[PDB]
Structure formats: structure tokens, C-alpha cells
């Protein structure tokens, strides 16, 4: 069965905290290892995972936390076009349990509903643009009020070949706010952020840097007086390395680099490194 590729299986493994860097967090019950299961052959494709979160470590369970959320997502593709330009994503997640109504109210029922269709906005090879709309509901209350309290999220992706030979993925994030200008707002920061990243192929190792800001507000600080230490990175840069295994596994390695070049790599302000494991067959 292993030799045959009739069944397509995907497994993803993630760790919320890794000891590799040597840095951790305050609470244990806020981080655990994760495994994602995906299967598809005939019927549609379904991913199942469980998420347990302990706001208090004492209220977290080593065997299995009674405060638990099931994570379920099923993806649908529809060939109403020559290409699979039509798709639907459905996500089901329950917050808490509704099996019992025992005193104390440690048991509670909140539902998270996700509906997100896939759309190919542009159907041309030279320039591709995509966008997906995701609608979320929570608790019983939002279901009762319906679309009124529904949270709406939209992500859009633009593929432009800057050098023609390589394609750049630019993602635009759309959130619904008041969307009204205010005198209390200086306008220093943009209401939307443009995040751009590209896959660079170096053997079996893929290099994918991303920038928080695709088009920076200014060319530089461009002041006649500069301070070496910046309070925080306005444009954050993350670099992913895809590492290959001869067995047939691929892992994504996270690295964070500061805007200012480091002559001394022996000492860095921040250290963010993470490993994601993907199995696809």
C-alpha cells in the first residue's frame, strides 16, 4: 500500500514551543505539540486536530484537558471552469463541551463556524490574483444574531513576476473596522499592511523570506541624527528554509533577522526559530 499512491495522505507536525533556541514562555498549558491529519481519495478532503488551552496551568490536564476544542476543516473543489477556480472551505470548531450542564459552569457551549470560498479573481497566467472570504461565528449568541455579529475576514493574494522568471506572492489583508477617519488618528500608520514573500529554489531547499511591509512608508529614516537602537521593527522580516529529508519528509525552518545587519552573530536581540514538518504522499 505504501508503494501505491492511490490514497493521498498529508500529515503536518508543529511545536508551539521548541527548546532549540532555549527560550520558552511563562505558562506550560499554553503550548503543546500538534499533528494535522489530511486524507483524500474519492470523498472530499478532511483535516482533524484537537486544541487544548489552559488559561491556568492548574486547570490544564496532562492526560487530557477537560477544556478542549475540536478542530475540523473540510475542503471542497468544484470544476465549474477548465481549472479548479471554484472551491469551498468549511471549518467546524467547538469551544468547550455541551454534553453536561453540571454546576460550576466549567462546561459551556460556544461554536465557531467558518465558511470560506476560494476564488480565482484573475484567470490569466501572466498575472494572477486570488481572494478568499471567511465568515466566523462564535458562541450560541452570534448564531442567534446571525450575520449581525458575524466576523468577516478576507485575504487576497497577488502573484506578480518582478523578474518574469520568478513570481512574487503579495498578500493583502482585509479587515472590517469602522473604516472612518478620525482626528485622534495621526494617519502615521496605514489601516492595511501589505505582506510580500517569494519562494527561492536552492536545490531541495526552498528559501522564502517575507516582509511585513511590501512598500515602506519612507525610503529610510532619512534624518541627520540617528539612534542605533530602534524601539521595534516597523517592517518585520522572516526567513523560511525548506529542509529535505531522504526518507521523504520536508520541514520548514523559521529564522528571524533584524533590519540592521549584524557583524556579531554571537549576540542578537531576538531569536525566533521553529520547525514545521510536512508529510505529503
From Swiss-Prot:
It is a multi-pass membrane protein. It is found in: Cell outer membrane. GO terms for molecular function: maltose transporting porin activity; oligosaccharide transporting porin activity; porin activity. Keywords: Cell outer membrane, Ion transport, Membrane, Porin, Signal, Transmembrane, Transmembrane beta strand, Transport. GO terms for biological process: carbohydrate transmembrane transport; monoatomic ion transport. It holds the Pfam family Porin_OmpG. Disulfide bonds: none annotated. The keyword Transmembrane applies. One of its GO terms (cellular component) is pore complex. The chain crosses the membrane at residues 7-15, 27-37, 44-52, 69-78, 84-92, 109-116, 129-138, 152-162, 166-175, 181-189, 193-202, 210-218, 220-228, 234-245, 249-259, 269-280. Monomer. Forms channels functionally larger than those of classical porins. May act as a regulator of the RCS-phosphorelay signal transduction pathway. This is Outer membrane porin G. The lineage of its organism: Bacteria, Pseudomonadati, Pseudomonadota, Gammaproteobacteria, Enterobacterales.
Amino acid at each position: 500500500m505504501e508503494e501505491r499512491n492511490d490514497w493521498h495522505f498529508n500529515i503536518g507536525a508543529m511545536y508551539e514551543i521548541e527548546n532549540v533556541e532555549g527560550y520558552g514562555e511563562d505558562m506550560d498549558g499554553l503550548a503543546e505539540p500538534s499533528v494535522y491529519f489530511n486524507a483524500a481519495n474519492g470523498p472530499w478532503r478532511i483535516a482533524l486536530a484537537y486544541y487544548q488551552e489552559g488559561p491556568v496551568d492548574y486547570s490544564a490536564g496532562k492526560r487530557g484537558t477537560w477544556f478542549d476544542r475540536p478542530e475540523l476543516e473540510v475542503h471542497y473543489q468544484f470544476l465549474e471552469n477548465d481549472d479548479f477556480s471554484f472551491g469551498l472551505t468549511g471549518g467546524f470548531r467547538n469551544y468547550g463541551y455541551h454534553y453536561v450542564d453540571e454546576p460550576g459552569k466549567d462546561t459551556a457551549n460556544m461554536q465557531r463556524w467558518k465558511i470560506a470560498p476560494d476564488w480565482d479573481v484573475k484567470l490569466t497566467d501572466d498575472l494572477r490574483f486570488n481572494g478568499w472570504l471567511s465568515m466566523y461565528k462564535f458562541a450560541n449568541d452570534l448564531n442567534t444574531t446571525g450575520y449581525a455579529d458575524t466576523r468577516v475576514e478576507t485575504e487576497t493574494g497577488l502573484q506578480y513576476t518582478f523578474n518574469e522568471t520568478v513570481a512574487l506572492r503579495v498578500n493583502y489583508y482585509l479587515e472590517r473596522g469602522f473604516n472612518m477617519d478620525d482626528s485622534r488618528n495621526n494617519g502615521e500608520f496605514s489601516t492595511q499592511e501589505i505582506r510580500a514573500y517569494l519562494p527561492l529554489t536552492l536545490g531541495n531547499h526552498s528559501v522564502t523570506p517575507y516582509t511585513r511591509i511590501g512598500l515602506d512608508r519612507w525610503s529610510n529614516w532619512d534624518w541627520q541624527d540617528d539612534i542605533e537602537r530602534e524601539g521595534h521593527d516597523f517592517n518585520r522580516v522572516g526567513l523560511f528554509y525548506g529542509y529535505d529529508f531522504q526518507n521523504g519528509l520536508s520541514v520548514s525552518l523559521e529564522y528571524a533577522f533584524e533590519w540592521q545587519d549584524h557583524d556579531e552573530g554571537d549576540s542578537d536581540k531576538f531569536h525566533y526559530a521553529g520547525v514545521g514538518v510536512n508529510y505529503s504522499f
